[PDB]
Amino acid sequence: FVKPRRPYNSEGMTRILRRYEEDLFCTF
Amino acid sequence: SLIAAHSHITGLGLDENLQPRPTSEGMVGQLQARRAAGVILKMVQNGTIAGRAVLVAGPPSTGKTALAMGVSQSLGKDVPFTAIAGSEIFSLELSKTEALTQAFRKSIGIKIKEETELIEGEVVEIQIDRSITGGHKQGKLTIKTTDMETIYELGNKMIDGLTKEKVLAGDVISIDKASGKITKLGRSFARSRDYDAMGADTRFVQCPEGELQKRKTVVHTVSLHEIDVINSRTQGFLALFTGDTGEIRSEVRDQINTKVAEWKEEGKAEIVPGVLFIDEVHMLDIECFSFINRALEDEFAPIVMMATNRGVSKTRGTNYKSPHGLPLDLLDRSIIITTKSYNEQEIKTILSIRAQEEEVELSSDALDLLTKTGVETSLRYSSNLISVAQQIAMKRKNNTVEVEDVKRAYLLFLDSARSVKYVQENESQYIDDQGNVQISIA
Amino acid sequence: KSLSLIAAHSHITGLGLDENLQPRPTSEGMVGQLQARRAAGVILKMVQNGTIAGRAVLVAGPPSTGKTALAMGVSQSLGKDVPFTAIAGSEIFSLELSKTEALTQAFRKSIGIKIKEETELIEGEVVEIQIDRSITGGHKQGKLTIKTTDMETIYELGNKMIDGLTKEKVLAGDVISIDKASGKITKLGRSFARSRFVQCPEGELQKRKTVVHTVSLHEIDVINSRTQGFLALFTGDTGEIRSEVRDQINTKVAEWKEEGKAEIVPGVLFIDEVHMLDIECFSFINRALEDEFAPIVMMATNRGVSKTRGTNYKSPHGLPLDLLDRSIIITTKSYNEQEIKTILSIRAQEEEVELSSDALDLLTKTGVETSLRYSSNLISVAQQIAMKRKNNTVEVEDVKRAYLLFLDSARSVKYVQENESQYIDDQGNVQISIAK
Amino acid sequence: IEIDVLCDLTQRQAKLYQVLKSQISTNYDAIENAATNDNLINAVMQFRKVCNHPDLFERADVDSPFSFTTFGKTTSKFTDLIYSSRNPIKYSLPRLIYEDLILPNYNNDVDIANKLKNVKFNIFNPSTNYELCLFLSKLTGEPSLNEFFRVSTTPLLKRVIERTNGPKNTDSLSFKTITQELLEVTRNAPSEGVMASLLNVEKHAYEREYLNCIQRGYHPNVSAPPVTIEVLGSSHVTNSINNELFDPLISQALSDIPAITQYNMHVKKGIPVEDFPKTGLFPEPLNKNFSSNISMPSMDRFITESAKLRKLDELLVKLKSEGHRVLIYFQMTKMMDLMEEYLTYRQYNHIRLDLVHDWQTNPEIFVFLLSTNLTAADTVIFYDSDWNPTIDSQAMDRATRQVTVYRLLVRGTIEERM
Amino acid sequence: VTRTAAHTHIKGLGLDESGVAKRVEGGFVGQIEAREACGVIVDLIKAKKMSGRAILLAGGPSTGKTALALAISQELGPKVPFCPLVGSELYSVEVKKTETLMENFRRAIGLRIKETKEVYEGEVTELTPEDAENPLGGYGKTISHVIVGLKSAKGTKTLRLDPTIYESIQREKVSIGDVIYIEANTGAVKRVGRSDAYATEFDLETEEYVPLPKGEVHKKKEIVQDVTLHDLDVANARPQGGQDVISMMGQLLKPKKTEITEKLRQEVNKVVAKYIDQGVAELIPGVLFIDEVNMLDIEIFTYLNKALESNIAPVVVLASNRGMTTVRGTEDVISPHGVPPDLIDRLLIVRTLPYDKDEIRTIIERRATVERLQVESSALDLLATMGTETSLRYALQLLAPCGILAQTSNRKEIVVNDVNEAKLLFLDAKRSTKILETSANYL
Amino acid sequence: RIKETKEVYEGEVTELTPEDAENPLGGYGKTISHVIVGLKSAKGTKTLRLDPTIYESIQREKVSIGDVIYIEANTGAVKRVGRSDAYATEFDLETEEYVPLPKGEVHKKKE
Ligand SMILES: Nc1ncnc2c1ncn2[C@@H]1O[C@H](COP(=O)(O)OP(=O)(O)O)[C@@H](O)[C@H]1O
Ligand SMILES: Nc1ncnc2c1ncn2[C@@H]1O[C@H](COP(=O)(O)OP(=O)(O)O)[C@@H](O)[C@H]1O
Ligand SMILES: Nc1ncnc2c1ncn2[C@@H]1O[C@H](COP(=O)(O)OP(=O)(O)O)[C@@H](O)[C@H]1O
């Protein structure tokens, strides 16, 4: 069977999102 | 590029039966030395034996370093050829034995087999999660081709390579997994809303099709000294460029030798030995010769080629005179190639080839007078006069060198022998060995 | 303790002397050399009295005549807690220290300061450890039951002792030592309950032990000089300690001696092959001996009327006349047949080699003819030839076999002069071919 | 159909072979003779143990440096693991030297002399040497005249840590060199720029020669902490040594703060980012493999360390592709366990010596392990090959299809003479 | 196939059980008395009882001294430490030559220690730090403790850590889903790699994927280590391997040789003696080989007379090729073999004799079959005649140009014409010297 | 002899605002979509639309309204030249140096 993906934990960390139409930047 | 002394020599000029042609690959004459050098070339190409000393001996201006560059040019790529002079061993931060050990270990190449994976496609989404201070970085990369799509996981080096040469969700990138290289090939999405803080004019490439991930076998050659310097301390890769490798301990070298034999045993690596060329080998101390005599007997030893232009002269560090400036222990374990002086036709062919390399057109009578002055004086003087005569002929606005141009070049620029003659009639004008000089003209 | 295979001076346990400082013919591993042993005994009493400072004594004689043996006898007769420094003449030509600075460090390693202090320690066997923790672990309470063979107690513990017991994991049945003022706890081992092994301590749990320290003046010089730590005493990078801190250490040591908190224990510096120093070193040594904090310097040399280094003239013993004027000289003499045979028997007894009488006579004869060291070298290589034929005692044939296989000075010299074209001479000439 | 396979000894196998040869003090002829005849049997048992697989003589384990430490060890809802590594060498110091040389008291002048030398007679003091400070501020461009007094009285590592790139005024004597001007442009510059590529030789040489996938060749033999100095009866010595060995500023500098703690400090406590302790100053290692001195055992070296196992791994692929059923023969059970765990690593369908008819009925099972009626076998393999015909004849007797035997032999050992 | 360099046809002394040297055994031809003396020396080293025993191998050039040194090294085996050295290697620009000699003396001593190790290992399940009350207090860390949960096969353990261990854990760059390995002796952490319990094909960091470790999380394992005393001295002089700041910054500084004191060596000796007394360690003394000992000056010799008298000194083998020559560092002292007479009295000299025509011929035979070459009988006679006329080494090296010249004519066998062609192409010392004497301008 | 083309934006800052997105993400504050920065120089004024990742460099170089800055094209990576000369005498005692307002247009490509 298909093995589960590794857990992803991003707590208290900024984020930079880059998409086709719009770029975000989430800050604290 | 630019024109050097041995820019006309590309190879050794030999047949399949190791027989020299009279004129081939920029080399003319010197048949026996070229045949012996071809034998040494096949000895290196076999890779079976280790630690052979070859001595090249002859008078000056005969073709010693010409033979060395012929061997290096016929040796091919990926085989190391370390060329040092006799005076580079003396250092203020390295001992003589340490410098010779590093010169020995620079001439042994380790060819490593590496399995890599290549990923090319269009970037769909980049998510980057960083800490507040910006030290810890993690994220995800969403890449696509025509048929496939896969969300990957990134680490610190991938985000560092992604922020450098910024990719912007629609660029086409190529990822090398083993070398860690991010290469931007172009842009295909053609996003309408571009907040132009930049003057990017990126190429319009097609979106690639087929498999996203592809395996590939690569090969790269590294030296034994480079593995030692990398494994010596924490920042040895910098010391491969700054030369801050101060007296690497012996334990590092034993462990590197054992690990290299282990890598040979799994078929991951192989050992490609090369040639170390020591020019002007008479400028070495007796301790260096005593070290070389026992450093030639190791498993990882290259073929050592030495060039000497000296007769029965004093060995450095001692008070006795020995043949070739070398002690008899070093001469016992060496095979000597003897190089001979030239005729006039060889000098003419040398001057014609050196004129063809410098793109300088010579007349017939200019060639005969340059041949005559290269026979009476040395050959290097007549080779040096060619560019000067070309500039003299270019002053008169004609693109051919005549007898008048080379005659003016001979008048303006002096030989050695005419300089000795002019100094010896005017010894009062020049400062002697005792410090006396007459400066006043009356 | 003090791992050691077999040394050349391993049979010397001291100077064999009576209560009237008279040498026995054989005692403590030393035979012969009666006047030299008497002079070294007078020098030893001079060191033990400790009321004089900075006197130089030269031991001179022919090679292989008991000089380093005399130095070893003095060093063994001094025993522990008295400094003995042994340097060679080539040990001061350094690349990071000057010659006078290295000589000053060698001089100051040979003077000690004796300090007696008392510290209270607890040692015993752990019976039961109870430790109670809260939900967050902010406050911890505990009890410790410990015992000796004569008493048992229970102790209420605080937080930091609980943290020092959790670290260095202590279970029941371990023998531990606790220092209260520093918080240092060392596990001595486990007791006799098999179910390393040491015995349970006896007596009082709370004991005051007086420990005698001996610290050299070089150590206080390195510590008081703030430019480097105490780790330079182990790594070796002190790097030309300034003079001013040496005056402060000298004044503080004099103050501690006057107040009664310390006493000076002077020692011996031994310089072997003293002829290999320079004239600057001799000039420094001339004035370094006139200090109150100076040890007794023993110098050994074998040269006679040779060139003094750094100069271009020749002097007796390789030393200039100013240094010889400040010295008293002990002279060693060549040995006889009986002393050679006694030395060979003592050496063979120390290497656990059983010898026949005739093998001993052959070794004595070849020691008189060639050298004492050559016979002492053959006396242990003949045992392997004997054990190759599976016997215990070394007989005459094994000694003859060792004499044939291994050469000495004179035979090798004879073979070199009879075959001089096969060797490399001063001119770098050799003939390696056999024919022509 | 008898096939013999020869493989050369590996480096480790030759190492324990030479160790076993040198151990019994040169009696190899009688060893070989009475090994061929079949005390001395216990001597040759080690020889065939080395010739089979080097793990029987000595099992390979984790490769780490020797720890020159005395630490808190165990003599056997959480557990505490606290750092307790020390050095076995102890340097003992009396209390008198400390109390009368390093600590201030009423009868010594440490602090008075320290103040006199460091504050009063300091030549960067603006209370007495204002002109020198003004001259130096025109020279350097420092906005403050107390900067030189601060620099001259602080240690170097602290000066490296809290160094901040503050602005300096233009009207000064300090400059910008062309090397620094070349450095500052390419700090954030992308690829394919001419200046950026001319200033990035080392990174291109790193990425061309594949240096993030290379292996570590050297590790140290002994690792040892600093020498522990003890003073009996002094808490001040312990506090000073703990402050020097575990200085919070440098220890924080060579580490980093966790991200959730940074979130709790910035948002839940209102600490600005400029007030955070400086972190992340440790140099990056070359690879992931270069970060530590501990090397774990790998299941690629386990195959290659035995020449017989390597040759059998190469031989098993062709028989797997041709779809046969292979019989492997042994003499001991330790090698049986080793080959069982190797086969479970390779995940081959195998059974270990009610099993007979299971072997004949099911064709999915590939390797049968046997120790010295199986008609379904096609290829039989002698690992520990012995040429006694009494055992070999019955082993081929218990084995319609073509039957091929294989013998794995090692060059230059007891088996080659066998 | 395999590589050879002037050796590796020598496998040992080739003695019997009684110590008698057979004529052609072990790759050795002749030198029977020297081989017997070296065998007695090998037994003396194996006896493990003596210290500071020195021999000298004296003979001409090309007579078999280095061959005897590697024969002794192969007879003693890989367990016994052997330290080869040329006399030019002692002159270091970083430290004085006395310290280099003492460093090699301590390097020629072995030690086999059985060391126990406390190991925590497993796959990281949780990673949760707890915060301090006042992070900006100046004294103290930002965190107080970190809870790490490790799981393995038949086990799951919860660990509370001090900050000093967790700094090393985060320096190894662990994450949730990582198999780690913690050493309790020094605080070292090794991150093995990713666990295989999750997906594999979604990474970009060339990682290696390991299964869950066997056994319990907390372990005690026994490791046999092979160290030298120089390793202990170097590891104590420049400390690394602790988690404290000074050892933490000792890894980043550029290494440099220092003058190790006598006090550190005495303390290291005390620790090793305490290890031996508890039945843990075992001492393996070894051999130091100094080839070309005539390159030493009088200071290193004078230090050798003191360093030989220590109670821990190894067996030192010297080699010379000198007749009655002046010692370096002197002007008028002339001594046999270039070695001063104060040291010669402490040596045992072993003679090494030249060869004959038959010995030269069979040496060429073994060097031919080791290099994988086939020679005719007449070519072998011509090569032996050359070896007597000029040198053995010149006849030895001329084999591979002859093999190349035979292969270039589509042949395997070496014939007389190939040897004559290699005679013409390559010269020796005597012919080149004769060309040098009769030459125009210093050829 | 190396030649290069630099495209650069410089001038006095008239406005500096981070624009919030249409739909904010939970768990964060200040989800920015673009940063609007207005530049002013001699005979010129131009308002720019920038990446949100220029805002951390804005906070890093401590750029407020009134300072003169220096924006190069491909890298972003602002750096504060100084304060304008028109704001020189707002305070009796201060340090921020005062450089003149730049000449030419805010957009220039120089070889
Ligand atoms: N056979 C040759 N073929 C090509 N060039 C040659 C030849 N002989 C000499 N030269 C030229 O003559 C010059 C002298 O060569 P060099 O190696 O310096 O001689 P030597 O061995 O005497 O030092 C070189 O610049 C080389 O280009
Ligand atoms: N009187 C003696 N008693 C015992 N052993 C002696 C005596 N004299 C010399 N020896 C031994 O002879 C050996 C060589 O003498 P040594 O003292 O080295 O000569 P030198 O006096 O030149 O230093 C030493 O091992 C020493 O133990
Ligand atoms: N007894 C011998 N048997 C076989 N080969 C020998 C013998 N003696 C010398 N050789 C060979 O001769 C060469 C020179 O010997 P070597 O010992 O290195 O020089 P030296 O005798 O000057 O120390 C070596 O390559 C070695 O293989």
Helix axes B286-295, B96-105, angle to 10 degrees: 40
CA C87 – CA E98 distance, rounded (Å): 12
Q: Are D343 and D302 in contact (CB under 8 A)?
A: no
Check if D220 contacts E (Cβ < 8 Å): yes
CA D147 – CA D134 distance, rounded (Å): 11
Contact flag C236-E18 (C-beta cutoff 8 Å): no
The technique is cryo-EM
- Show residues of chain E in contact with D93, CB under 8 Å: none
Residue B288 CB: number of other CB atoms within 10 A? 24
B9 phi and psi, to 5 degrees? -105, 115
Pocket test for ligand 2, best of C10, C64, C272, C374 (most atoms within 8 A of CB): C64
Residue B136 CB: number of other CB atoms within 10 A? 20
Helix or strand (DSSP H, E) at E423: helix E416-425
Contact flag B328-C427 (C-beta cutoff 8 Å): no
**Dihedral (CA of C338, C344, C349, C355) sign:** negative
Helix or strand (DSSP H, E) at C255: helix C243-259
Ligand 2 within 6 A of C27 CB?
Answer: no
CA C229 – CA C250 distance, rounded (Å): 20
CA B33 – CA E81 distance, rounded (Å): 45
CA E340 – CA F104 distance, rounded (Å): 86
Check if F59 contacts B (Cβ < 8 Å): no
Contact flag D233-C120 (C-beta cutoff 8 Å): yes
Q: For the CA atoms of B373, B375, B377, B381, what is the dihedral angle to 10 degrees?
A: 70
Three-state secondary-structure class, residue C129:
strand
User: Of B116, B252, B266, which is closest to D218 when you measure between CB atoms?
Assistant: B252
Residue type, B123: V
Q: Are D386 and D363 in contact (CB under 8 A)?
A: no
- Show residues of chain A in contact with E202, CB under 8 Å: 5-6
Three-state secondary-structure class, residue D187:
coil
CA E376 – CA D392 distance, rounded (Å): 44
User: Strands E82-86 and E287-291, how do they pair?
Assistant: parallel
- Show residues of chain E in contact with D222, CB under 8 Å: 227, 231-232, 234-235
CA D351 – CA D369 distance, rounded (Å): 7
The residue among E114, E234, D220 whose CA lies nearest residue B255 is D220
Summarize the annotated binding site of C for ATP as residue ranges: 61-68
Q: Which atom of ligand 1 is nearest to the CA of B61?
A: 22
Compute the nearest-CA separation of E340 from chain D (Å): 36
Contact flag A11-D260 (C-beta cutoff 8 Å): yes
User: In terms of CA atoms, which chain D residue is nearest residue F97?
Assistant: D169
CA E316 – CA E52 distance, rounded (Å): 7
The residue among E274, E255, E157 whose CA lies nearest residue E213 is E157
Contact flag A11-D262 (C-beta cutoff 8 Å): no
CA E43 – CA E64 distance, rounded (Å): 20
Pocket test for ligand 3, best of E9, E13, E15, E63 (most atoms within 8 A of CB): E63
- Reported structure resolution in angstroms: 2.6
User: Of B133, B165, B179, which is closest to D207 when you measure between CB atoms?
Assistant: B179
- E10 CA from centroid of ligand 3 (Å): 9
Ligand 1 within 6 A of B62 CB?
Answer: yes
Q: Which of E245, E270, E276, E277 to mutate to test the interface with D (most CBs of D within 10 A)?
A: E245
Ligand 1 within 6 A of B347 CB?
Answer: no
Pocket test for ligand 2, best of C68, C274, C301, C378 (most atoms within 8 A of CB): C68
Q: Which atom of ligand 1 is nearest to the CA of B339?
A: 21
Contact flag B230-D214 (C-beta cutoff 8 Å): yes
Place of tokens 């201070």: B133
User: Of A22, A23, A28, which is closest to F28 when you measure between CB atoms?
Assistant: A28
Helix axes E399-407, B31-46, angle to 10 degrees: 90
Ligand 2 within 6 A of C375 CB?
Answer: no
Q: Are E217 and A25 in contact (CB under 8 A)?
A: no
- Show residues of chain B in contact with C429, CB under 8 Å: 328
Residue type, B233: R
E strand intervals along D98-250: 222-223, 228-230
Q: Are E171 and D255 in contact (CB under 8 A)?
A: yes
**Ligand 3 pocket by Cβ (under 6 Å):** E 6-7, 27-31, 61-67, 363
CA B240 – CA B227 distance, rounded (Å): 10
DSSP string, B383-425: HHHHHHHHHHHHHTT-SSB-HHHHHHHHHHS--HHHHHHHHHT
Bridge partners (DSSP) listed for residue E220: E118
Check if B168 contacts A (Cβ < 8 Å): yes
Q: Are E26 and E11 in contact (CB under 8 A)?
A: yes
- Show residues of chain E in contact with B246, CB under 8 Å: 94, 254-256
Check if C231 contacts D (Cβ < 8 Å): yes
Provide residues of C within 8 Å CB-CB of chain B. Answer: 424, 426-430, 432
Ligand 1 within 6 A of B61 CB?
Answer: yes
Could you tell me which residues come within 8 angstroms of residue E439 by beta carbon, excluding any fewer than 6 positions away? B59, B311
Bridge partners (DSSP) listed for residue C265: C112
The residue among D363, F3, F73, D212 whose CA lies nearest residue B182 is D212
- B382 CA from centroid of ligand 1 (Å): 13
User: Strands F29-41 and F6-20, how do they pair?
Assistant: antiparallel
CA C306 – CA B437 distance, rounded (Å): 47
Is B79 buried (19+), middle (13-18) or exposed (0-12) by CB count in 10 A?
middle
Q: Which atom of ligand 3 is nearest to the CA of E321?
A: 22
Buried b / exposed e along C402-421 (16+ C-beta atoms within 10 A): bbebbbbbeebbebbeeeee
Q: Are E400 and E371 in contact (CB under 8 A)?
A: yes
Helix axes E262-277, E229-237, angle to 10 degrees: 130
Residue type, C1: K
Three-state secondary-structure class, residue C145:
strand
Based on its alpha-carbon atoms, the radius of gyration of chain B, rounded to whole angstroms, reads 30
Helix axes C357-369, C396-405, angle to 10 degrees: 30
Residue-level length of chain B:
442
- C365 CA from centroid of ligand 2 (Å): 18
Give the angle subtended at the CA of D227 by the CAs of D223 and D229, to the nearest 5°: 160
- E43 CA from centroid of ligand 3 (Å): 23
CA B9 – CA B74 distance, rounded (Å): 10
User: In terms of CA atoms, which chain F residue is nearest residue B194?
Assistant: F49
DSSP string, D83-137: ---B-S-EEE--HHHHHHHTS--TT--HHHHHHIIIIIS-TT-TTT-HHHHHHHH
Which residues between 88 and 117 in chain D have a beta carbon less than 8 angstroms from any beta carbon of chain A? none
CA C375 – CA C377 distance, rounded (Å): 5
Nearest ligand for residue B49 CA: 3
- B8 CA from centroid of ligand 1 (Å): 11
Is C125 buried (19+), middle (13-18) or exposed (0-12) by CB count in 10 A?
buried
CA D35 – CA B77 distance, rounded (Å): 52
CA C340 – CA C373 distance, rounded (Å): 10
The residue among E132, E159, E157, E162 whose CA lies nearest residue E145 is E162
- B350 CA from centroid of ligand 1 (Å): 9
CA E338 – CA E345 distance, rounded (Å): 14
Check if B423 contacts D (Cβ < 8 Å): no
Chains that contact D by 3+ CB pairs under 8 Å?
A: A, B, C, E, F
Nearest ligand for residue B52 CA: 3
E76 phi and psi, to 5 degrees? -75, -30
Buried b / exposed e along E376-389 (16+ C-beta atoms within 10 A): eeebbebbbebbbe
Q: Are B13 and B25 in contact (CB under 8 A)?
A: yes
Residue C149 CB: number of other CB atoms within 10 A? 12
Contact flag D190-F74 (C-beta cutoff 8 Å): yes
**Dihedral (CA of B393, B399, B404, B406) sign:** positive
Ligand 2 within 6 A of C67 CB?
Answer: yes
The residue among D300, D305, D302 whose CA lies nearest residue D10 is D305
Place of tokens 């029941």: C172
